[PDB]
């Protein structure tokens with residue numbers, strides 16, 4: 001069908017955080033390996049102008065200034081810290097369009113357009129017409145309080161969802177949504 005786009009998750013893995021070798025709160029304690037999915041929305045037979053609105057759905061504890069080593073931003077920005085549920089550990093999130101020239105968008109509001117970033121100040125801006133919508137995902141872990149030594153399990157958490165919007169009413173009205181996931185895993189703290 002013309003509008004038969006279907007969602008697919010985009011996921012990033014706790015298991016890629018290096019060992020945290022250790023006091024200031026909050027502070028970033030490492031970055032996960034950034035991930036990407038070219039086909040978060042895909043499958044409709046008629047090309048469309050599309051955009052993705054990200055809404056985080058974990059508790060927001062506060063803000064921290066940061067500049068991802070990954071991505072190409074040269075200035076620090078404010079990021080919302082989201083509660084993993086594990087005491088002392090939060091995450092911050094950036095997202096971007098799929099292709100490398102689009103900028104990392106810090107998640108620091110209730111919702112934001114991750115691509116095109118122009119849509120945050122122009123409600124009629126969309127990606128150029130094509131058959132898919134993808135994105136890049138960046139996450140860093142944040143010490144929000146004192147951490148014990150040793151291994152810690154992080155549960156799998158849904159960080160939020162991307163809503164597909166379009167200037168084609170029939171596609172926009174479907175309110176297709178795709179999950180943005182933190183795959184759980186183990187981290188290790190070494191307190192010397």
Ligand SMILES: OC[C@H]1O[C@@H](O)[C@H](O)[C@@H](O)[C@@H]1O
Pocket residue numbers: 037038039097098099127128130131132133134135
């Ligand atoms: O840049 C807009 C879109 O271009 C397409 O060619 C890519 O497959 C999508 O991942 C991307 O969202």
Ligand SMILES: [Cl-]
Pocket residue numbers: 009010011035036037
């Ligand atoms: Cl993915």
Ligand SMILES: [Cl-]
Pocket residue numbers: 013016033034035
């Ligand atoms: Cl990975």
Ligand SMILES: [Cl-]
Pocket residue numbers: 036037038039
């Ligand atoms: Cl992909």
Ligand SMILES: [Cl-]
Pocket residue numbers: 066067068071073075076077094104
């Ligand atoms: Cl950044």
Ligand SMILES: [Cl-]
Pocket residue numbers: 156157158159
């Ligand atoms: Cl969850």
Ligand SMILES: [Cl-]
Pocket residue numbers: 167168169170
């Ligand atoms: Cl229309």
